Amino acid sequence: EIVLTQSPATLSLSPGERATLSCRASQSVSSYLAWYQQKPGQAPRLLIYDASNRATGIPARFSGSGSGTDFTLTISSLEPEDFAVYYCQQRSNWPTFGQGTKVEIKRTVAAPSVFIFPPSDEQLKSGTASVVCLLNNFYPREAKVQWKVDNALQSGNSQESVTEQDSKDSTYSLSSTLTLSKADYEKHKVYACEVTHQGLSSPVTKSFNR
Amino acid sequence: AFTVTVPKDLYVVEYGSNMTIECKFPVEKQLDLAALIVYWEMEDKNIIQFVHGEEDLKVQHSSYRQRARLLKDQLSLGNAALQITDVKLQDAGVYRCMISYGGADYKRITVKVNAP
Amino acid sequence: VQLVQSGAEVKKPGSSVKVSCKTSGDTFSTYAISWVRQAPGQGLEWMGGIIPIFGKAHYAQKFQGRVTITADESTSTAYMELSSLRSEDTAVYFCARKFHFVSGSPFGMDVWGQGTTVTVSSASTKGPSVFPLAPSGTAALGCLVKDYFPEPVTVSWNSGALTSGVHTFPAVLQSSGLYSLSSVVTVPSSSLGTQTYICNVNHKPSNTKVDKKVEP
Protein backbone atom coordinates (compact mmCIF):
# COMPACT_ATOMS: atom_id res chain seq x y z
CA GLU A 1 0.00 0.00 0.00
CA ILE A 2 1.11 3.51 -0.87
CA VAL A 3 -0.53 6.00 1.47
CA LEU A 4 -1.96 9.31 0.27
CA THR A 5 -2.36 12.08 2.81
CA GLN A 6 -4.59 14.88 1.63
CA SER A 7 -4.39 18.27 3.32
CA PRO A 8 -6.21 20.05 4.67
CA ALA A 9 -9.23 17.97 5.67
CA THR A 10 -11.63 20.90 5.24
CA LEU A 11 -10.95 23.92 3.04
CA SER A 12 -13.44 26.74 3.51
CA LEU A 13 -13.42 29.50 0.89
CA SER A 14 -15.73 31.76 -1.12
CA PRO A 15 -16.37 32.33 -4.85
CA GLY A 16 -13.54 34.17 -6.60
CA GLU A 17 -10.81 33.02 -4.25
CA ARG A 18 -8.10 30.55 -5.34
CA ALA A 19 -7.99 27.09 -3.73
CA THR A 20 -5.04 24.78 -2.98
CA LEU A 21 -5.32 21.06 -2.24
CA SER A 22 -2.27 19.01 -1.33
CA CYS A 23 -1.54 15.31 -1.60
CA ARG A 24 1.60 13.56 -0.39
CA ALA A 25 2.53 9.93 -1.05
CA SER A 26 4.39 7.66 1.39
CA GLN A 27 6.58 6.55 -1.53
CA SER A 28 7.46 7.76 -5.01
CA VAL A 29 4.51 7.40 -7.38
CA SER A 30 6.37 9.35 -10.08
CA SER A 31 3.82 11.17 -12.24
CA TYR A 32 1.05 8.58 -12.01
CA LEU A 33 -1.71 10.46 -10.22
CA ALA A 34 -5.27 11.57 -10.85
CA TRP A 35 -7.64 14.01 -9.15
CA TYR A 36 -11.39 13.40 -8.80
CA GLN A 37 -14.34 15.62 -7.82
CA GLN A 38 -17.14 13.81 -6.02
CA LYS A 39 -20.40 15.68 -5.27
CA PRO A 40 -22.64 14.01 -2.66
CA GLY A 41 -24.78 11.26 -4.19
CA GLN A 42 -22.49 10.88 -7.18
CA ALA A 43 -19.49 8.97 -8.51
CA PRO A 44 -16.02 10.60 -8.79
CA ARG A 45 -15.11 12.61 -11.92
CA LEU A 46 -11.54 12.78 -13.28
CA LEU A 47 -10.10 16.31 -13.30
CA ILE A 48 -6.33 16.04 -13.69
CA TYR A 49 -4.59 12.92 -15.07
CA ASP A 50 -0.88 12.00 -15.26
CA ALA A 51 -0.65 14.60 -12.48
CA SER A 52 -0.33 17.68 -14.74
CA ASN A 53 -2.82 16.94 -17.52
CA ARG A 54 -6.35 18.31 -17.53
CA ALA A 55 -9.13 16.16 -18.97
CA THR A 56 -11.15 17.68 -21.80
CA GLY A 57 -14.57 18.92 -20.74
CA ILE A 58 -12.96 20.21 -17.56
CA PRO A 59 -12.68 24.01 -17.01
CA ALA A 60 -9.30 25.69 -17.44
CA ARG A 61 -9.61 26.97 -13.87
CA PHE A 62 -8.50 23.50 -12.78
CA SER A 63 -4.83 22.53 -12.65
CA GLY A 64 -2.60 20.02 -10.92
CA SER A 65 1.11 19.34 -10.69
CA GLY A 66 4.01 17.61 -8.99
CA SER A 67 5.90 14.35 -9.35
CA GLY A 68 7.39 11.89 -6.89
CA THR A 69 5.87 12.44 -3.45
CA ASP A 70 4.33 15.95 -3.61
CA PHE A 71 1.22 17.01 -5.56
CA THR A 72 -1.18 19.95 -5.58
CA LEU A 73 -4.59 20.61 -7.13
CA THR A 74 -5.40 24.27 -7.70
CA ILE A 75 -8.69 25.96 -8.52
CA SER A 76 -8.06 29.46 -9.93
CA SER A 77 -11.41 31.05 -9.13
CA LEU A 78 -13.86 28.99 -7.10
CA GLU A 79 -17.11 28.45 -8.98
CA PRO A 80 -20.28 27.70 -6.97
CA GLU A 81 -20.31 24.29 -8.71
CA ASP A 82 -16.75 23.55 -7.55
CA PHE A 83 -17.65 22.91 -3.92
CA ALA A 84 -17.34 19.20 -3.08
CA VAL A 85 -14.81 16.66 -1.79
CA TYR A 86 -11.70 16.16 -3.88
CA TYR A 87 -10.00 12.80 -3.84
CA CYS A 88 -6.75 11.67 -5.48
CA GLN A 89 -5.43 8.36 -6.76
CA GLN A 90 -1.97 6.90 -7.42
CA ARG A 91 -1.36 4.41 -10.24
CA SER A 92 2.38 3.61 -9.77
CA ASN A 93 1.29 0.50 -7.87
CA TRP A 94 -2.05 -0.99 -6.76
CA PRO A 95 -4.30 2.07 -6.67
CA THR A 96 -4.81 3.78 -3.35
CA PHE A 97 -6.88 6.89 -2.68
CA GLY A 98 -6.55 9.71 -0.18
CA GLN A 99 -9.02 10.76 2.48
CA GLY A 100 -10.24 13.48 0.13
CA THR A 101 -10.52 17.21 0.82
CA LYS A 102 -13.96 18.78 1.30
CA VAL A 103 -14.30 22.35 0.09
CA GLU A 104 -16.92 24.37 1.94
CA ILE A 105 -18.44 27.65 0.77
CA LYS A 106 -17.28 30.41 3.14
CA ARG A 107 -19.75 33.19 3.93
CA THR A 108 -20.48 35.86 6.53
CA VAL A 109 -21.49 34.71 10.04
CA ALA A 110 -25.22 33.99 10.45
CA ALA A 111 -26.88 33.34 13.80
CA PRO A 112 -29.33 30.41 13.90
CA SER A 113 -33.04 30.97 14.43
CA VAL A 114 -33.82 28.65 17.32
CA PHE A 115 -37.15 26.90 17.80
CA ILE A 116 -38.48 24.14 20.03
CA PHE A 117 -41.17 21.51 19.44
CA PRO A 118 -42.82 19.57 22.30
CA PRO A 119 -43.68 15.95 21.55
CA SER A 120 -47.06 16.36 20.04
CA ASP A 121 -50.01 14.35 21.40
CA GLU A 122 -49.69 11.71 18.65
CA GLN A 123 -46.39 10.23 19.90
CA LEU A 124 -47.19 10.53 23.54
CA LYS A 125 -50.03 8.03 23.36
CA SER A 126 -47.48 5.61 21.89
CA GLY A 127 -45.60 6.07 25.17
CA THR A 128 -42.71 8.01 23.62
CA ALA A 129 -41.88 11.70 23.86
CA SER A 130 -39.54 13.43 21.41
CA VAL A 131 -38.76 17.05 22.16
CA VAL A 132 -37.02 18.75 19.23
CA CYS A 133 -34.72 21.75 19.05
CA LEU A 134 -34.12 23.34 15.66
CA LEU A 135 -31.28 25.59 14.55
CA ASN A 136 -31.96 27.27 11.25
CA ASN A 137 -30.02 29.13 8.55
CA PHE A 138 -26.74 29.49 10.42
CA TYR A 139 -23.07 29.73 9.49
CA PRO A 140 -20.53 28.40 10.27
CA ARG A 141 -21.40 24.75 10.98
CA GLU A 142 -20.01 24.78 14.52
CA ALA A 143 -22.80 25.00 17.09
CA LYS A 144 -23.27 24.02 20.74
CA VAL A 145 -26.69 22.67 21.72
CA GLN A 146 -27.35 21.78 25.35
CA TRP A 147 -30.47 20.18 26.78
CA LYS A 148 -31.68 20.89 30.30
CA VAL A 149 -34.81 19.67 32.05
CA ASP A 150 -35.96 21.60 35.12
CA ASN A 151 -32.49 23.19 35.14
CA ALA A 152 -30.61 19.89 35.01
CA LEU A 153 -28.04 19.74 32.23
CA GLN A 154 -29.14 16.71 30.25
CA SER A 155 -26.43 14.11 29.89
CA GLY A 156 -25.53 12.60 26.51
CA ASN A 157 -29.00 11.31 25.56
CA SER A 158 -29.76 13.60 22.58
CA GLN A 159 -29.37 12.97 18.82
CA GLU A 160 -27.97 15.80 16.68
CA SER A 161 -28.45 16.17 12.91
CA VAL A 162 -26.70 18.66 10.61
CA THR A 163 -27.92 19.38 7.09
CA GLU A 164 -25.57 19.99 4.16
CA GLN A 165 -24.81 23.57 3.06
CA ASP A 166 -27.84 25.12 1.42
CA SER A 167 -27.93 25.22 -2.36
CA LYS A 168 -28.71 28.96 -2.45
CA ASP A 169 -27.64 30.91 0.67
CA SER A 170 -24.99 28.40 1.85
CA THR A 171 -26.29 28.10 5.41
CA TYR A 172 -26.53 25.08 7.67
CA SER A 173 -29.37 23.88 9.84
CA LEU A 174 -29.34 21.62 12.89
CA SER A 175 -31.96 19.45 14.60
CA SER A 176 -31.35 18.05 18.06
CA THR A 177 -33.84 15.46 19.29
CA LEU A 178 -34.40 14.34 22.86
CA THR A 179 -36.33 11.07 23.15
CA LEU A 180 -37.83 10.17 26.52
CA SER A 181 -40.72 7.99 27.62
CA LYS A 182 -44.16 9.51 28.23
CA ALA A 183 -43.49 8.43 31.84
CA ASP A 184 -40.05 10.06 32.02
CA TYR A 185 -41.43 13.09 30.19
CA GLU A 186 -44.45 13.60 32.47
CA LYS A 187 -42.36 13.71 35.65
CA HIS A 188 -40.83 17.03 34.65
CA LYS A 189 -42.10 20.44 33.60
CA VAL A 190 -39.55 22.91 32.22
CA TYR A 191 -37.86 21.82 28.97
CA ALA A 192 -35.18 24.07 27.48
CA CYS A 193 -32.30 24.05 25.03
CA GLU A 194 -29.30 26.39 25.17
CA VAL A 195 -27.77 27.30 21.79
CA THR A 196 -24.28 28.69 21.24
CA HIS A 197 -23.08 30.28 18.02
CA GLN A 198 -20.71 32.98 16.81
CA GLY A 199 -23.46 35.22 15.44
CA LEU A 200 -25.10 34.77 18.81
CA SER A 201 -23.34 37.12 21.22
CA SER A 202 -25.20 35.46 24.10
CA PRO A 203 -26.66 31.96 24.38
CA VAL A 204 -30.29 31.78 23.28
CA THR A 205 -32.74 29.58 25.15
CA LYS A 206 -35.98 28.25 23.73
CA SER A 207 -38.35 26.50 26.11
CA PHE A 208 -41.89 25.60 27.16
CA ASN A 209 -43.62 24.58 30.38
CA ARG A 210 -45.25 21.16 30.16
CA ALA B 1 -6.13 -3.70 -32.25
CA PHE B 2 -3.86 -4.82 -29.45
CA THR B 3 -2.17 -7.97 -30.68
CA VAL B 4 0.54 -10.08 -29.08
CA THR B 5 2.77 -11.87 -31.59
CA VAL B 6 5.18 -14.82 -31.43
CA PRO B 7 8.07 -15.11 -33.91
CA LYS B 8 8.02 -18.93 -33.49
CA ASP B 9 4.90 -20.87 -32.46
CA LEU B 10 6.94 -24.07 -32.22
CA TYR B 11 10.31 -24.55 -30.52
CA VAL B 12 12.48 -27.64 -30.60
CA VAL B 13 14.96 -27.64 -27.73
CA GLU B 14 16.98 -30.46 -26.29
CA TYR B 15 17.64 -31.81 -22.84
CA GLY B 16 19.57 -29.93 -20.18
CA SER B 17 19.91 -26.80 -22.30
CA ASN B 18 18.79 -23.25 -21.53
CA MET B 19 15.90 -22.14 -23.75
CA THR B 20 14.14 -18.85 -24.39
CA ILE B 21 10.58 -18.42 -25.63
CA GLU B 22 9.99 -15.04 -27.24
CA CYS B 23 6.82 -13.00 -27.09
CA LYS B 24 6.40 -9.58 -28.71
CA PHE B 25 3.90 -6.86 -27.76
CA PRO B 26 3.33 -3.34 -29.16
CA VAL B 27 5.31 -0.55 -27.48
CA GLU B 28 5.41 2.91 -28.96
CA LYS B 29 7.94 5.29 -27.39
CA GLN B 30 8.82 4.50 -23.80
CA LEU B 31 7.59 1.48 -21.90
CA ASP B 32 5.27 2.38 -19.04
CA LEU B 33 6.27 -0.31 -16.60
CA ALA B 34 3.30 0.24 -14.34
CA ALA B 35 0.93 -0.51 -17.20
CA LEU B 36 2.69 -3.75 -18.05
CA ILE B 37 1.26 -7.13 -17.08
CA VAL B 38 2.91 -10.39 -18.16
CA TYR B 39 1.58 -13.93 -17.58
CA TRP B 40 3.54 -16.98 -18.68
CA GLU B 41 1.30 -19.99 -18.09
CA MET B 42 1.91 -23.48 -19.44
CA GLU B 43 -1.35 -25.40 -19.08
CA ASP B 44 -2.58 -25.54 -15.50
CA LYS B 45 0.84 -24.44 -14.20
CA ASN B 46 1.73 -20.83 -13.61
CA ILE B 47 5.34 -19.96 -14.51
CA ILE B 48 5.52 -16.16 -14.40
CA GLN B 49 2.98 -13.66 -13.06
CA PHE B 50 4.20 -10.09 -13.59
CA VAL B 51 2.32 -6.96 -12.44
CA HIS B 52 3.62 -3.47 -11.53
CA GLY B 53 7.21 -4.59 -12.02
CA GLU B 54 7.14 -7.44 -9.47
CA GLU B 55 7.02 -11.24 -9.63
CA ASP B 56 4.49 -13.03 -7.45
CA LEU B 57 6.33 -16.22 -6.67
CA LYS B 58 3.60 -17.45 -4.34
CA VAL B 59 1.58 -18.55 -7.37
CA GLN B 60 4.51 -19.93 -9.41
CA HIS B 61 4.42 -23.72 -9.80
CA SER B 62 7.11 -25.52 -7.80
CA SER B 63 8.45 -27.28 -10.93
CA TYR B 64 9.97 -23.95 -11.91
CA ARG B 65 11.91 -23.31 -8.66
CA GLN B 66 14.83 -20.96 -9.43
CA ARG B 67 14.59 -22.32 -13.00
CA ALA B 68 12.27 -20.12 -15.06
CA ARG B 69 12.91 -16.41 -15.48
CA LEU B 70 11.36 -13.53 -17.46
CA LEU B 71 14.04 -11.46 -19.18
CA LYS B 72 13.48 -7.86 -18.09
CA ASP B 73 15.83 -5.86 -20.32
CA GLN B 74 14.04 -7.00 -23.47
CA LEU B 75 10.74 -5.63 -22.11
CA SER B 76 11.59 -2.03 -23.00
CA LEU B 77 11.70 -3.30 -26.61
CA GLY B 78 8.29 -4.91 -26.55
CA ASN B 79 9.78 -8.36 -26.12
CA ALA B 80 8.61 -10.34 -23.11
CA ALA B 81 10.55 -13.58 -23.13
CA LEU B 82 10.75 -16.50 -20.72
CA GLN B 83 14.04 -18.31 -20.05
CA ILE B 84 13.82 -21.84 -18.71
CA THR B 85 17.26 -23.04 -17.63
CA ASP B 86 18.14 -26.76 -17.75
CA VAL B 87 15.12 -27.90 -19.77
CA LYS B 88 13.79 -31.28 -18.71
CA LEU B 89 11.47 -33.66 -20.56
CA GLN B 90 8.45 -32.45 -18.63
CA ASP B 91 8.98 -28.92 -19.97
CA ALA B 92 7.62 -30.10 -23.31
CA GLY B 93 4.06 -28.96 -23.84
CA VAL B 94 2.02 -25.90 -24.76
CA TYR B 95 2.99 -22.56 -23.26
CA ARG B 96 0.70 -19.54 -23.15
CA CYS B 97 1.79 -15.92 -22.98
CA MET B 98 -0.71 -13.27 -21.82
CA ILE B 99 0.19 -9.59 -21.87
CA SER B 100 -1.57 -6.38 -20.95
CA TYR B 101 0.04 -3.12 -22.00
CA GLY B 102 -2.73 -0.78 -22.91
CA GLY B 103 -5.09 -3.55 -24.00
CA ALA B 104 -4.44 -7.28 -23.64
CA ASP B 105 -3.87 -10.43 -25.76
CA TYR B 106 -2.32 -13.91 -25.49
CA LYS B 107 -0.53 -16.49 -27.64
CA ARG B 108 0.39 -20.16 -27.69
CA ILE B 109 3.80 -21.76 -28.11
CA THR B 110 4.39 -25.49 -28.40
CA VAL B 111 7.74 -26.78 -27.10
CA LYS B 112 9.22 -30.14 -28.03
CA VAL B 113 12.32 -31.39 -26.22
CA ASN B 114 14.23 -34.09 -28.08
CA ALA B 115 16.02 -36.90 -26.23
CA PRO B 116 19.80 -37.57 -26.13
CA VAL C 1 -17.45 3.87 -22.87
CA GLN C 2 -20.06 3.40 -20.11
CA LEU C 3 -20.65 1.42 -16.90
CA VAL C 4 -23.97 0.42 -15.30
CA GLN C 5 -24.37 -1.36 -11.98
CA SER C 6 -27.14 -3.36 -10.31
CA GLY C 7 -29.65 -1.72 -7.98
CA ALA C 8 -29.25 -1.29 -4.22
CA GLU C 9 -29.68 -4.23 -1.83
CA VAL C 10 -30.47 -4.92 1.83
CA LYS C 11 -28.92 -8.11 3.17
CA LYS C 12 -29.02 -9.47 6.73
CA PRO C 13 -25.69 -10.41 8.44
CA GLY C 14 -23.77 -13.53 7.43
CA SER C 15 -25.65 -13.81 4.16
CA SER C 16 -24.05 -13.21 0.79
CA VAL C 17 -24.47 -10.58 -1.94
CA LYS C 18 -23.58 -10.38 -5.64
CA VAL C 19 -23.45 -7.03 -7.46
CA SER C 20 -23.82 -6.73 -11.25
CA CYS C 21 -21.93 -4.42 -13.60
CA LYS C 22 -22.29 -4.11 -17.38
CA THR C 23 -20.04 -2.39 -19.95
CA SER C 24 -21.87 -0.66 -22.83
CA GLY C 25 -18.61 0.82 -24.07
CA ASP C 26 -15.25 -0.15 -25.51
CA THR C 27 -14.00 -3.74 -25.49
CA PHE C 28 -14.91 -5.73 -22.36
CA SER C 29 -12.70 -8.83 -22.42
CA THR C 30 -9.56 -6.80 -23.17
CA TYR C 31 -9.55 -4.11 -20.45
CA ALA C 32 -9.48 -4.44 -16.66
CA ILE C 33 -12.47 -3.55 -14.53
CA SER C 34 -12.09 -2.90 -10.82
CA TRP C 35 -14.42 -2.87 -7.82
CA VAL C 36 -14.34 -0.10 -5.21
CA ARG C 37 -15.93 0.20 -1.79
CA GLN C 38 -16.78 3.61 -0.38
CA ALA C 39 -17.77 3.25 3.27
CA PRO C 40 -20.11 5.86 4.81
CA GLY C 41 -18.27 9.11 5.51
CA GLN C 42 -15.11 7.35 4.37
CA GLY C 43 -12.53 7.19 1.61
CA LEU C 44 -12.67 5.02 -1.47
CA GLU C 45 -11.11 1.56 -1.26
CA TRP C 46 -9.75 -0.60 -4.06
CA MET C 47 -11.12 -4.07 -3.47
CA GLY C 48 -10.03 -6.01 -6.52
CA GLY C 49 -10.00 -6.08 -10.30
CA ILE C 50 -9.96 -8.47 -13.24
CA ILE C 51 -9.07 -8.55 -16.94
CA PRO C 52 -11.78 -10.94 -18.23
CA ILE C 53 -9.71 -12.90 -20.79
CA PHE C 54 -7.12 -13.69 -18.10
CA GLY C 55 -9.91 -15.36 -16.17
CA LYS C 56 -8.59 -14.73 -12.66
CA ALA C 57 -9.10 -11.63 -10.48
CA HIS C 58 -6.68 -9.75 -8.21
CA TYR C 59 -7.71 -8.75 -4.66
CA ALA C 60 -6.50 -6.37 -1.96
CA GLN C 61 -5.16 -8.17 1.12
CA LYS C 62 -8.02 -6.71 3.19
CA PHE C 63 -10.68 -8.20 0.93
CA GLN C 64 -8.64 -11.34 0.13
CA GLY C 65 -11.01 -13.82 1.77
CA ARG C 66 -14.60 -12.65 1.32
CA VAL C 67 -14.47 -11.05 -2.12
CA THR C 68 -15.00 -13.00 -5.31
CA ILE C 69 -14.65 -11.18 -8.62
CA THR C 70 -15.83 -12.88 -11.81
CA ALA C 71 -16.02 -11.60 -15.39
CA ASP C 72 -18.56 -12.91 -17.87
CA GLU C 73 -17.23 -12.14 -21.35
CA SER C 74 -20.32 -13.64 -22.93
CA THR C 75 -22.51 -10.87 -21.56
CA SER C 76 -19.74 -8.30 -21.03
CA THR C 77 -20.95 -8.29 -17.43
CA ALA C 78 -18.75 -8.20 -14.33
CA TYR C 79 -19.73 -9.45 -10.89
CA MET C 80 -18.50 -8.90 -7.36
CA GLU C 81 -19.58 -11.29 -4.64
CA LEU C 82 -19.23 -10.41 -0.97
CA SER C 83 -19.32 -13.50 1.28
CA SER C 84 -20.03 -13.47 5.03
CA LEU C 85 -21.83 -10.15 5.28
CA ARG C 86 -21.41 -8.01 8.36
CA SER C 87 -22.45 -4.84 9.87
CA GLU C 88 -19.73 -2.42 8.57
CA ASP C 89 -19.69 -4.01 5.08
CA THR C 90 -22.42 -1.42 4.49
CA ALA C 91 -21.03 0.92 1.84
CA VAL C 92 -21.37 2.32 -1.68
CA TYR C 93 -19.84 -0.22 -4.03
CA PHE C 94 -18.51 0.92 -7.42
CA CYS C 95 -17.06 -0.75 -10.50
CA ALA C 96 -14.63 1.26 -12.57
CA ARG C 97 -12.59 1.24 -15.77
CA LYS C 98 -9.44 3.10 -16.80
CA PHE C 99 -9.14 5.58 -19.67
CA HIS C 100 -6.65 4.16 -22.17
CA PHE C 101 -4.70 7.45 -22.16
CA VAL C 102 -4.14 8.02 -18.42
CA SER C 103 -1.45 5.32 -18.30
CA GLY C 104 -0.12 4.06 -14.98
CA SER C 105 -1.68 0.89 -13.57
CA PRO C 106 -4.21 -1.14 -15.63
CA PHE C 107 -6.45 -1.10 -12.55
CA GLY C 108 -6.69 2.69 -12.41
CA MET C 109 -10.24 3.99 -12.09
CA ASP C 110 -11.66 6.68 -14.32
CA VAL C 111 -15.03 5.66 -15.74
CA TRP C 112 -17.37 4.66 -12.90
CA GLY C 113 -20.65 2.83 -12.46
CA GLN C 114 -23.50 4.81 -10.91
CA GLY C 115 -22.86 2.94 -7.67
CA THR C 116 -24.48 0.18 -5.64
CA THR C 117 -25.68 0.76 -2.10
CA VAL C 118 -25.48 -2.24 0.20
CA THR C 119 -27.05 -2.20 3.66
CA VAL C 120 -26.27 -4.91 6.19
CA SER C 121 -28.65 -5.10 9.14
CA SER C 122 -30.82 -7.51 11.10
CA ALA C 123 -33.69 -5.03 11.26
CA SER C 124 -36.78 -5.87 9.22
CA THR C 125 -38.58 -3.73 6.66
CA LYS C 126 -40.78 -1.25 8.54
CA GLY C 127 -42.51 1.95 7.45
CA PRO C 128 -42.12 5.20 9.43
CA SER C 129 -44.42 6.72 11.99
CA VAL C 130 -44.94 10.42 11.31
CA PHE C 131 -45.53 13.09 13.95
CA PRO C 132 -46.21 16.84 13.53
CA LEU C 133 -44.31 19.67 15.18
CA ALA C 134 -46.32 22.46 16.81
CA PRO C 135 -45.26 25.70 15.03
CA SER C 136 -42.68 27.78 16.98
CA GLY C 137 -42.96 37.11 12.77
CA THR C 138 -41.25 34.04 11.35
CA ALA C 139 -42.54 30.63 12.44
CA ALA C 140 -41.19 27.12 11.93
CA LEU C 141 -43.07 23.97 11.07
CA GLY C 142 -41.99 20.37 10.81
CA CYS C 143 -42.52 16.64 11.14
CA LEU C 144 -40.78 13.82 12.92
CA VAL C 145 -40.24 10.75 10.75
CA LYS C 146 -39.46 8.10 13.30
CA ASP C 147 -38.47 4.43 13.34
CA TYR C 148 -38.22 3.31 9.71
CA PHE C 149 -36.13 0.68 7.91
CA PRO C 150 -34.46 0.68 5.52
CA GLU C 151 -33.30 3.95 3.97
CA PRO C 152 -34.29 6.20 2.26
CA VAL C 153 -37.34 8.21 3.10
CA THR C 154 -38.39 11.09 0.90
CA VAL C 155 -40.29 14.01 2.39
CA SER C 156 -42.48 16.36 0.34
CA TRP C 157 -44.50 19.07 2.03
CA ASN C 158 -47.65 20.24 0.31
CA SER C 159 -47.83 17.49 -2.27
CA GLY C 160 -44.51 18.97 -3.46
CA ALA C 161 -45.75 22.58 -3.74
CA LEU C 162 -44.02 24.34 -0.82
CA THR C 163 -40.34 23.72 -1.65
CA SER C 164 -38.63 26.91 -0.45
CA GLY C 165 -37.56 27.19 3.18
CA VAL C 166 -37.71 23.45 3.89
CA HIS C 167 -34.99 21.36 5.50
CA THR C 168 -34.99 17.56 5.63
CA PHE C 169 -32.11 16.51 7.87
CA PRO C 170 -29.95 13.49 7.07
CA ALA C 171 -31.30 10.32 8.66
CA VAL C 172 -29.94 9.33 12.06
CA LEU C 173 -29.62 5.63 12.85
CA GLN C 174 -30.90 4.79 16.32
CA SER C 175 -29.56 2.12 18.65
CA SER C 176 -32.68 0.09 17.75
CA GLY C 177 -31.23 -0.41 14.28
CA LEU C 178 -34.15 1.61 12.99
CA TYR C 179 -33.65 4.99 11.27
CA SER C 180 -35.31 8.21 12.40
CA LEU C 181 -35.44 11.57 10.66
CA SER C 182 -36.80 15.11 10.82
CA SER C 183 -38.10 17.52 8.17
CA VAL C 184 -38.66 21.20 8.92
CA VAL C 185 -40.08 24.18 7.03
CA THR C 186 -39.75 27.87 7.87
CA VAL C 187 -42.79 29.99 6.98
CA PRO C 188 -44.00 33.46 8.02
CA SER C 189 -46.04 33.54 11.24
CA SER C 190 -49.17 35.03 9.64
CA SER C 191 -49.38 32.10 7.19
CA LEU C 192 -50.56 29.74 9.94
CA GLY C 193 -54.23 30.77 10.00
CA THR C 194 -54.30 31.16 6.23
CA GLN C 195 -52.42 28.49 4.28
CA THR C 196 -52.80 24.78 4.98
CA TYR C 197 -49.60 22.91 5.80
CA ILE C 198 -49.54 19.18 5.23
CA CYS C 199 -46.47 16.90 5.16
CA ASN C 200 -46.10 14.05 2.63
CA VAL C 201 -43.82 11.19 3.63
CA ASN C 202 -42.88 8.32 1.35
CA HIS C 203 -41.18 5.04 2.20
CA LYS C 204 -40.33 3.20 -1.00
CA PRO C 205 -38.86 0.03 0.59
CA SER C 206 -42.01 -0.62 2.65
CA ASN C 207 -44.37 0.94 0.10
CA THR C 208 -45.61 3.36 2.73
CA LYS C 209 -47.11 6.70 1.78
CA VAL C 210 -47.91 8.85 4.81
CA ASP C 211 -49.68 12.18 5.14
CA LYS C 212 -49.63 14.43 8.17
CA LYS C 213 -51.43 17.75 8.72
CA VAL C 214 -49.37 20.00 10.97
CA GLU C 215 -51.34 22.42 13.16
CA PRO C 216 -50.99 24.69 16.23
Domains of chain C: 1-122 (2.60.40.10), 123-216 (2.60.40.10)
Query: Chain C within 8 Å of A176 (Cβ-Cβ)?
Result: no
Domains (range + CATH), chain A: 1-107 (2.60.40.10), 108-210 (2.60.40.10)
CATH no. for residue B96? Answer: 2.60.40.10
Q: How far, in whole angstroms, is CA A177 from its chain's centroid?
A: 19
Q: By three-state DSSP, how is residue C141 classified?
A: strand
Asked if residues B19 and B84 have their Cβ atoms less than 8 Å apart, the reply is: yes
Provide the experimental method for this PDB entry: X-ray
Closest-CA distance, B107 to chain C, in angstroms, reads 12
Give the Å distances, CA to CA, from C128 to C151, C154, C207: 10, 11, 10
Asked if residues A104 and A17 have their Cβ atoms less than 8 Å apart, the reply is: no
User: What residues contact residue B27 under an 8 Å CB cut-off, 6+ apart?
Assistant: B76, B77, B78, B101
Contacts of C134 in chain A (CB under 8 A): 117-118, 120
Query: Chain A within 8 Å of C193 (Cβ-Cβ)?
Result: no
Phi, psi of A197 (to 5 degrees): -140, 180
Residue whose C-alpha is closest to residue C184's, from C127, C108, C117, C133: C133
CB atoms closer than 10 angstroms to residue B94:
12
For B99, nearest residue in chain C (alpha carbons): C54
Q: How far apart are CA A110 and CA C142, in angstroms?
A: 22
Asked if residues B2 and B102 have their Cβ atoms less than 8 Å apart, the reply is: yes
* Stretch 135-174 of chain C: residues touching chain A, C-beta under 8 Å: 136, 138, 140, 142, 144, 146, 167-170, 172, 174
**Residue B87 structural domain:** 1-116
C103 to B34: CB separation less than 8 angstroms, yes or no: yes
Asked if residues C89 and C58 have their Cβ atoms less than 8 Å apart, the reply is: no
* Stretch 72-101 of chain A: residues touching chain B, C-beta under 8 Å: 91-94
E strand or H helix that includes residue C191: helix C191-194
Number of structural domains in chain B: 1
The DSSP code for B66 is: T
Asked if residues A208 and A118 have their Cβ atoms less than 8 Å apart, the reply is: yes
- What is the residue type of A176? S
B114: left (phi over 0), alpha (psi -120 to 50) or beta: beta
Q: Who among B1, B35, B104 is closest to C105 (CB)?
A: B35
